[PDB]
Amino acid sequence: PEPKPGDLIEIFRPFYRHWAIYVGDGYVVHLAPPKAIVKKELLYDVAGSDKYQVNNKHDDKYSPLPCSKIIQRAEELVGQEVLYKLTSENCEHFVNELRYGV
């Protein structure tokens, strides 16, 4: 089933979860090493063969930003580097910041 634009994507990679944000038409916005940059890539490629799901876990208590703001922000961040560690705590924080705001 296809994710909605703005949906948080939890990719069950072996021994670690990788987070992304769906920005429509098959694409996700996520942090990746090409030292790590914000990339706009195909969900097909980012998920690979790994199991994944939509997980807007904080939607029950927190209110998501309008889907226009989620996409404008996520896409206007693409290209910008992050000099911090690619921890699942940080990958979750990065996407939660895009969906819910600061």
Side-chain angles (χ1 to χ4, degrees), residues 1-3 5-34 36-60 62-68 70-72 74-80 82-84 87-88 90-102:
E2 266 260 310
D7 281 340
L8 297 190
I9 308 294
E10 179 176 26
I11 306 136
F12 302 112
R13 301 241 169 97
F15 293 88
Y16 78 103
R17 291 137 68 249
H18 187 219
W19 286 92
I21 194 151
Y22 195 73
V23 290
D25 301 317
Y27 295 94
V28 303
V29 165
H30 75 136
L31 294 171
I37 181 169
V38 186
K39 294 182 192 177
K40 179 178 153 158
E41 291 176 299
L42 285 156
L43 170 47
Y44 181 73
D45 305 330
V46 177
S49 309
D50 305 317
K51 285 170 181 159
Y52 70 90
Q53 65 174 9
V54 168
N55 194 348
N56 310 321
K57 49 175 129 189
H58 301 107
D59 265 35
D60 249 85
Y62 291 75
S63 177
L65 292 161
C67 289
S68 273
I70 307 180
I71 295 145
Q72 170 198 43
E75 289 175 337
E76 84 195 351
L77 271 195
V78 175
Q80 289 185 72
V82 302
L83 311 142
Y84 58 85
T87 72
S88 186
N90 286 320
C91 260
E92 205 180 307
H93 182 69
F94 177 80
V95 297
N96 277 136
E97 221 179 302
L98 294 169
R99 179 170 185 81
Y100 303 95
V102 285

